[PDB]
Amino acid sequence: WEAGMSLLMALVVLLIVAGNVLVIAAIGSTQRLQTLTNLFITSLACADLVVGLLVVPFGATLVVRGTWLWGSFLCELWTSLDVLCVTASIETLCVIAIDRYLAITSPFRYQSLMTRARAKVIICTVWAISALVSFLPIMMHWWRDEDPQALKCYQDPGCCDFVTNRAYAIASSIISFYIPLLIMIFVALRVYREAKEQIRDRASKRKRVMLMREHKALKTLGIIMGVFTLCWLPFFLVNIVNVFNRDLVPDWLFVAFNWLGYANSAMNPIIYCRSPDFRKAFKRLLAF
Ligand SMILES: CC(C)(C)NC[C@H](O)COc1cccc2c1CC(C#N)=N2
Ligand SMILES: CCCCCCCCS[C@@H]1O[C@H](CO)[C@@H](O)[C@H](O)[C@H]1O
Ligand SMILES: CCCCCCCCS[C@@H]1O[C@H](CO)[C@@H](O)[C@H](O)[C@H]1O
């Protein structure tokens, strides 16, 4: 592992940036990929794209140099963007979970109402809600603390630690993560028990094949979500324990799970290779 993880980090920017750009272009070419569900996937990709383009590069100069070299302002701005992307992602994963549920339960009402021009409004909203609950409180300094040590970090332009009061710490992590998480999980468990009773004896390859595509594609969504959890959940669990006893967890561990979450921005394009369409579409653009 000390090899794979060591290699992983030198290409993360690449694997994220190139991996996600490869996904947005794959769908922008094949209109057979141009569906409703794949529009939310593009949102997800834009999030991850920003991560590897802004979040990770600056996170790298900080970790490597062991100091912030960009100034007090960009520090806050970088922090904002970082928080915005994670919230937007977990919310979009909710929308997707709910979308697939309403397309499984109310098919008719789904087709006459859910249009391509409307899924775009739904996406602009999720970026709007995330900008509110993530970007604004940081701008109004609702995050800050009063501890001498905390105040010490704010006077230093070279310090970019997210030292926050225990009120904010708990509120922001519940709003951004745990709520959409619990919602996405709950809804995702529902969509599964629905997809199980569908394929649960007397139908030709007319109904079997159409349910063979809409089950292999659903299984991928469940992975995108399950993976997203395994990556970020640790960071947020530790972020809560820090509130109870601030000296219980080492700082290197705090930075450990945070880069684990960043890895999720490169994993998506990879999992999308469970589909022939994407797989072929990738090899298309890669001049194979
Ligand atoms: C180096 C930094 C600190 C930039 N990493 C931030 C992390 O990626 C994301 O942290 C958060 C994401 C969403 C919601 C959050 C959150 C931290 C808190 C708190 N209280 N609420
Ligand atoms: C889209 C802009 C995102 C900024 C995110 C970090 C905000 C830090 S507080 C912010 O700092 C600015 C510069 O000092 C002031 O001019 C503002 O009044 C104040 O609210
Ligand atoms: C995303 C929303 C996070 C809300 C966090 C809980 C509400 C208080 S935050 C913070 O508490 C400080 C001490 O009470 C006050 O001095 C500040 O003015 C205030 O901003």
Ligand nearest to the CA of 142: 3
160-170: b (≥16 Cβ within 10 Å) or e: bbbbbbeebbe
Cα of 84 from ligand 1 centre, angstroms: 9
Binding site as annotated, residues for cyanopindolol: 82, 172, 258
Q: Which of 68, 141, 172, 240 to mutate to test the pocket of ligand 1 (most atoms within 8 A of CB)?
A: 172
**CA proximity to 33, closest of 288, 279, 207, 211:** 279
Q: Compute, in angstroms, the gap from residue 106 CA to the centroid of ligand 2.
A: 45
Q: What is the dihedral of CA 181, 183, 186, 187, to 10 degrees?
A: -120
The structure tokens 């100091």 sit at 67
Residue 266: which residues within 8 A CB-CB, separation 6 or more?
Answer: 12, 15, 16, 19, 20, 48, 52
CA–CA distance, 242 with 239 (Å, rounded to integer): 5
* Ligand 1 atom, smallest distance to 173 CA: 21
Q: How many angstroms separate the alpha carbon of residue 169 from the centre of ligand 3?
A: 10
Rounded distance between C-alpha atoms, residue 100 and residue 95, angstroms? 9
Please name the residue whose Cα sits nearest to atom 17 of ligand 1: 173
Ligand lying closest to the C-alpha of residue 133: 3
Q: How far is the CA of 262 from the centre of ligand 1 (A)?
A: 12
Q: Measured between alpha carbons, how far is 118 from 254 in angstroms, rounded to an integer?
A: 40
Alpha carbon nearest to ligand 3 atom 12, residue? 142
Ligand 2 contact via 136 beta carbon (within 6 Å) = no
Cα distance between residue 96 and residue 105, in whole Å:
14
How far apart CA 220 and CA 78 sit, in angstroms, is 31
Residue 102: exposure state from Cβ atoms within 10 A (0-12, 13-18, ≥19): middle
Residues comprising the chain, all counted? 288
Q: Report how far residue 231's alpha carbon sits from residue 222's, in angstroms, rounded to the nearest whole number.
A: 14
Which residues are within 8 A (CB) of 80 and not within 5 positions of it... i.e. 6 or more apart? Answer: 134, 135, 138, 139
Quickly list DSSP for 69-88: -S-HHHHHHHHHHHHHHHHH
Whether domain 1-288 has CATH 1.20.1070.10: yes
User: This structure's resolution (angstroms)?
Assistant: 3.2
Nearest-angstrom CA–CA distance, 177 and 126? 14
Radius of gyration of the chain (CA): 21
Atom of ligand 2 nearest to the CA of 140: 20
Residue 93's SS3 state is helix
